[PDB]
Amino acid sequence: ALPQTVRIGTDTTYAPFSSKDAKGEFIGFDIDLGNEMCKRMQVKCTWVASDFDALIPSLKAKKIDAIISSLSITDKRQQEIAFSDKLYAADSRLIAAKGSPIQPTLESLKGKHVGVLQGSTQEAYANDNWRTKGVDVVAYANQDLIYSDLTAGRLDAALQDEVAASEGFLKQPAGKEYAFAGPSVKDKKYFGDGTGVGLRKDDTELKAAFDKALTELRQDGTYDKMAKKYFDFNVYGD
């Protein structure tokens, strides 16, 4: 049976997806998506701020009923929990100097120096797909140093999370002469298959209810109106 009130956990330290405003209200694209789906589902939802690492523990313990916190649908989490259909994509993309002919192909990158953040999903992807094949992939302890090396011409490109690179560098003064080089790199093994509402594997009516509501708001155009506030590109992906 559907919960009388669905408690949704989110980590509010990730603008533009989940944050708190000056009044303490939850704001952001995940929050908009979440509230709209509860509306169509016709349930009461309550947002519970939580640290990201506590979210799947809290779900499993039944402290919350759903997670909407940019949670990407990876194979390893599918082992533990269930997911709604994709809410939006969470892919990576190369950033280079405006007008660069660089592409995310092995053909284009051989010879180049690509910076990657050490220990991220991007380094895993870049190491298996590109560094083993002779692209010079350099891993950085810190994101600041990646951006300064790119700016300094020490790096030819940086592989980063697409939305993070958009919001956090190509929109900053420092990124004005830089741009995405080529299309985003999609790989379910390293980046997952978009993000989705995290749910208990057993709660199939609640998954059905979120899936129905998400198709509806996508079909009547509400998804696009909502995305328009934050993103000038197709966040949904394919």
Tell me the technique behind this structure: X-ray
**205, 213 Cβ separation under 8 angstroms:** no
User: Closest Cα to residue 1, out of 183, 209, 233?
Assistant: 209
Q: Both 186 and 213 in a single domain? A: no
Adjacency order of strands within the sheet including 44-49: 44-49, 5-10, 66-67, 198-199, 82-83
The CA distance from 42 to 98, in Å, is: 47
The CA distance from 62 to 200, in Å, is: 9
Whether 72 has a binding-site annotation, put simply, is yes
Number of domains in the chain: 2
Q: Which residues are CB-neighbours of 72 under 8 A, at least 6 positions away?
A: 90, 191, 192, 193, 194, 195, 196
Q: Both 65 and 133 in a single domain? A: no
Q: Both 66 and 107 in a single domain? A: no
Residue with tokens 């980590």: 11
Three-state secondary structure of 73-109: CCHHHHCCCEECCCCECCCEEEEEECCCCCCCCHHHH
Q: Which residues are CB-neighbours of 236 under 8 A, at least 6 positions away?
A: 86, 88, 89, 223, 227
Q: Both 95 and 178 in a single domain? A: yes
**81, 65 Cβ separation under 8 angstroms:** no
Phi, psi of 184 (to 5 degrees): -70, 155
Q: Which residues are CB-neighbours of 104 under 8 A, at least 6 positions away?
A: 93, 94, 159, 181, 182, 183, 185
Q: Both 141 and 95 in a single domain? A: yes
Q: Both 105 and 124 in a single domain? A: yes
SS3 232: coil
The CA distance from 162 to 156, in Å, is: 17
Q: Both 14 and 73 in a single domain? A: yes
Whether 161 has a binding-site annotation, put simply, is yes
Cβ neighbours around 184 below 10 Å, total: 19
The CA distance from 12 to 94, in Å, is: 27
Q: Both 86 and 101 in a single domain? A: no
Whether 184 has a binding-site annotation, put simply, is no
**81, 42 Cβ separation under 8 angstroms:** no
Q: How far is CA 211 from CA 3, 106, 187, 216, in A?
A: 16, 38, 23, 9
Q: Both 224 and 183 in a single domain? A: no
Q: Both 97 and 211 in a single domain? A: no
Residue with tokens 């039944």: 62
Q: Which residues are CB-neighbours of 179 under 8 A, at least 6 positions away?
A: 95, 96, 97, 98, 99, 100, 170
Q: Both 155 and 223 in a single domain? A: no
Pairing of β 5-10 and β 44-49:
parallel
Instruction: Tell me, in Å, the resolution of the deposited structure.
Output: 1.9
The CA distance from 212 to 217, in Å, is: 9
Q: Both 210 and 221 in a single domain? A: yes
User: 29: which 2 tokens?
Assistant: 């694209």
> The domain that contains 105 carries what CATH number?
3.40.190.10
- Kindly provide the residue ranges of all beta strands, DSSP E only, lying in the chain, ordered along the sequence: 5-10, 19-20, 26-27, 44-49, 66-67, 82-83, 92-97, 113-117, 136-140, 157-161, 178-185, 198-199
- Kindly provide the residue ranges of all beta strands, DSSP E only, lying in 50-192, ordered along the sequence: 66-67, 82-83, 92-97, 113-117, 136-140, 157-161, 178-185
Which domain does 218 fall in, by range? 1-90+192-238
